[PDB]
């Protein structure tokens, strides 16, 4: 991989289903067009300053996983255990639930033209996408990657149609929605903070950039150069798509809209308006099919330290797929969509993710006072992880002191419930602990035909 | 004027505001069946019904002078006392009248909410006086409207 | 100033579109009100308009006398209750909600 | 004997038994059938749901004579700017549609409206 083809993996991973779902709730919190475009630019700065901090840790430590070896080197085994627990039950199944709910908003919306589709059709079509993707990825290890090339191709076709059609209509003089852009706004730290949650969901994927892009012709120069080029190129596409929405829509019509891209495609492309619910739905299950490939990489290394059940990250003998980890992610994702509601799963995902984004970036500053003699090839200026830590404190504390809703309580009570399991199964190796786990490991092994992966660390 | 009627609880503006709020928040009023009864020199009585929703609205409007009404002789299966949902005299909101004798002043209108499963458009004696546009039934377990009646 | 069978023709045919509804002013033409006279206006519209069409109702307008001067002040509240409990679209002339 | 972490060859002497072959097989075909039930129940509800109401069927209409509604520039005549300043009153009446009568540039403002220019507003 060169430099130019290193940009292609960064852009193709970050651009997903977020730009088709998030513009309604960024505008709903900052109720003007002017501050709505400031937020979509400021999340592009947080995503590039966050990915530069992860690029330093990824060449410093050189152990696979996610944030798990970065948290173990800085604090010890307690926040490393809490990351593998909170990514097992909170972070990874809610990501799979938001995407499959985003697929169902776009399949159902052209059949309800001036109307709102009922929640039972949105949820029972999103549940059929979770079960179908979990069945395909648990049987056909090579089939998920062949169709991924035509899902990436359908994704950046509909992105280029929206960006170009917005520049043509803006040239003809359709600029009357940007006239008094800063009248009617919120300087509230609960409304600004929730516009950052939904804006940073569309930028999600900047922290998984470390591992699959170490295969470059000259790392330690081409990796930090792929972040300064790759993610501000995504920020240029996200601002241009939101400008393209406000040329055909008022800020009031965008709030009263089920799917924001089927409303755009009804005013611009009339005799072929069905290509927007067709390509966005292909782009969305391509984003859900991609996450089931790496299911088990963090599970395996956390099980090696004894911080995770080892019956997960077993491999089926026929159809060499990580079938226990894929089936477990599908069960928690169908449980999350029954209370459901995108704008409640986005706040639930973003509170847990940015609690641990700010712990590894603070761990970068801890490892400069505690962990010298450590051979840093990439080295950031020290003010970049300082402000990225303080912004992560703002994204955690401000929702619970301004607009405390009930999903922020279930997210705390599920993370700290893992803190009890640390003191009963890791810290105090009780005798009745492995009297339970290996009976479950042995019987699930014969039920699914799954073996230990014929694989050591590397 | 508008300003003095915003601060009067028995004004014409207040009755207009919660009649249009009730019309916006009730599927029986904006979408339901319309089933009128027999003619009368004094009053007009009709119902608003919808299949799957197991309550009805009973509208009683006196257009003559002061009269007394026996609603038992017009609708079968009513209780001995009915609660008023809305009245042209808004002091009578939530009050209970007795079904056998309902006293109506000149120009008095009442809306009753009655829990029942006896819809008039299903009976063959009232089907010729029942009307709909955009016919649908309501599913209370799924919270949807459906057309397969 | 038209017959009900000619007014209903503006609804069109099931295979030919026309007006969404013709405006119904038959309640505005009642100079005195009664139980039999309100009944015959309501049943004339519902029986004559085609099946599955949308009705509408008016009680006044710019060419009609205002309702508290046409019928009296005792009928303001009950004519508003009639307008919002009948099927279809209620149409309100300005000032009727106050009783001008 | 199965212990906890069996290889490929110890597992095959026990995974083919009847107490592990039929609970694996019915749990696979109840998931594939649940994909086809949740898909057919989606096409059942979409094809059976009624076409919902247009905006002109949903809420009440409010008819305004524009010369008599609200005067904003102190000339004794109601204007279109005076209607814009009273839109909070109209939304508090739970009104869906505003019906404005004729405001075209006219020589005759009664008797069914003799209009001079169908594409201009009258200056009053
Ligand atoms: C209400 C809140 C709680 C809800 C909980 C719901 C739980 C529902 C579980 C449903 C499981 C569905 C599994 C089928 C998924 C098929 C996906 C697929 O394509 O498979 C390919 C895969 C390919 O196999 P092949 O066809 O043999 O090649 O098929 C299977 O492996 C099917 C095996 C079924 C696996 C069932 C696993 C169930 C684990 C339950 C263990 C519970 C232990 C608890 C002990 C507690 C002790 C305290
Ligand atoms: C195929 C999908 C299912 C397979 C995976 C689940 C297996 C079924 C058993 C479920 C758990 C049964 C009780 C725990 C048994 C192990 C206890 C123990 O002693 O650990 C030793 C264990 C080591 O065991 P070893 O792997 O044998 O060495 O120590 C730990 O791993 C500590 C970490 C425990 C992590 C617990 C994970 C629990 C997953 C289920 C969470 C349920 C809530 C989901 C979210 C709420 C709904 C939204
Ligand atoms: C109608 O006008 C009267 C008098 O102009 C207002 O009544 C009171 O006026 C005195 C001044 O003489 C004020 O001190 C009082 O506060 C007024 N009363 C109230 C209740 O405001 C009255 O406000 C006007 N408006 C109405 C009746 O809606
Ligand atoms: C209800 O309507 C019927 C029929 O329209 C009325 O019955 C007769 O109607 C004719 C002409 O419409 C009159 O000449 C008769 O005098 C009416 N008969 C009686 C006994 O009144 C009937 O009056 C109406 N009103 C009711 C039943 O209250
Ligand atoms: N690991 C993941 N796939 N996370 C979700 C990525 C979401 C993606 N950035 C989007 O625009 O929707």
From Swiss-Prot, chain A:
Residues noted as binding L-arginine in the record, renumbered to the chain: 14-18, 204
PANTHER family given in the database record: AMINO ACID TRANSPORTER, B(0,+)-TYPE AMINO ACID TRANSPORTER 1
This protein's encoding gene: SLC7A9
Subunit relationships: Disulfide-linked heterodimer composed of the catalytic light chain subunit SLC7A9 and the heavy chain subunit SLC3A1. The heterodimer is the minimal functional unit. Assembles in heterotetramers (dimers of heterodimers) and higher order oligomers; the oligomerization is mediated by SLC3A1 likely to prevent degradation and facilitate heteromer trafficking to the plasma membrane. Interacts with CAV1.
Stated name of the protein: b(0,+)-type amino acid transporter 1
Membrane-spanning segments: 3-26, 34-55, 82-108, 119-140, 141-164, 189-209, 223-245, 274-296, 323-341, 342-362, 382-402, 406-421
One Gene Ontology term from the biological process aspect of the record: neutral amino acid transport
Impact upon substituting residue 113 to A: No effect on amino acid transport activity
Effect seen on changing residue 23 to L: In CSNU; impairs protein stability and dimer formation
Effect of residue 453 to F/I/M/W: Decreased amino acid transport activity
Disease involvement: Cystinuria: An autosomal disorder characterized by impaired epithelial cell transport of cystine and dibasic amino acids (lysine, ornithine, and arginine) in the proximal renal tubule and gastrointestinal tract. The impaired renal reabsorption of cystine and its low solubility causes the formation of calculi in the urinary tract, resulting in obstructive uropathy, pyelonephritis, and, rarely, renal failure.
Reaction it catalyzes: L-leucine(out) + L-arginine(in) = L-leucine(in) + L-arginine(out); L-histidine(out) + L-arginine(in) = L-histidine(in) + L-arginine(out); L-arginine(in) + L-phenylalanine(out) = L-arginine(out) + L-phenylalanine(in); L-cysteine(out) + L-arginine(in) = L-cysteine(in) + L-arginine(out)
Membrane topology field: Multi-pass membrane protein
Effect on the protein of changing residue 354 to A: Complete loss of amino acid transport activity
Cytoplasmic face residues: 56-81, 210-222, 297-322, 363-381, 422-458
Gene3D superfamilies: Amino acid/polyamine transporter I
Subcellular location: Apical cell membrane; Cell membrane
Entry keyword Repressor: no
UniProtKB/Swiss-Prot annotation, chain B:
Cystine crosslinks: 35-130, 137-149
Keyword NAD: no
An annotated GO cellular component: membrane
Molecular function (Gene Ontology), one example: amino acid transmembrane transporter activity
Task performed by this protein: Acts as a chaperone that facilitates biogenesis and trafficking of functional transporter heteromers to the plasma membrane. Associates with SLC7A9 to form a functional transporter complex that mediates the electrogenic exchange between cationic amino acids and neutral amino acids, with a stoichiometry of 1:1. SLC7A9-SLC3A1 transporter has system b(0,+)-like activity with high affinity for extracellular cationic amino acids and L-cystine and lower affinity for intracellular neutral amino acids.
Disease entry from the Swiss-Prot or TrEMBL record: Cystinuria: An autosomal disorder characterized by impaired epithelial cell transport of cystine and dibasic amino acids (lysine, ornithine, and arginine) in the proximal renal tubule and gastrointestinal tract. The impaired renal reabsorption of cystine and its low solubility causes the formation of calculi in the urinary tract, resulting in obstructive uropathy, pyelonephritis, and, rarely, renal failure.
Name of the protein in its database record: Amino acid transporter heavy chain SLC3A1
Designated gene of the protein: SLC3A1
From Swiss-Prot, chain C:
Domain of life: Eukaryota
Expression across tissues: Expressed in the brush border membrane in the kidney (at protein level). Predominantly expressed in the kidney, small intestine and pancreas. Weakly expressed in liver.
Protein's cellular compartments: Cell membrane; Apical cell membrane
Coiled coil: none
Functional note: Acts as a chaperone that facilitates biogenesis and trafficking of functional transporter heteromers to the plasma membrane. Associates with SLC7A9 to form a functional transporter complex that mediates the electrogenic exchange between cationic amino acids and neutral amino acids, with a stoichiometry of 1:1. SLC7A9-SLC3A1 transporter has system b(0,+)-like activity with high affinity for extracellular cationic amino acids and L-cystine and lower affinity for intracellular neutral amino acids.
Subunit structure: Disulfide-linked heterodimer composed of the catalytic light subunit SLC7A9 and the heavy subunit SLC3A1. The heterodimer is the minimal functional unit. Assembles in non-covalently linked heterotetramers (dimers of heterodimers) and higher order oligomers; the oligomerization is mediated by SLC3A1 likely to prevent degradation in the endoplasmic reticulum and facilitate heteromer trafficking to the plasma membrane. Disulfide-linked heterodimer composed of the catalytic light subunit SLC7A13 and the heavy subunit SLC3A1.
Protein name (Swiss-Prot/TrEMBL): Amino acid transporter heavy chain SLC3A1
Organism from which the protein derives: Homo sapiens
High-level lineage: Eukaryota, Metazoa, Chordata, Craniata, Vertebrata
Residues of the whole record sequence present: 387 to 486 of 685
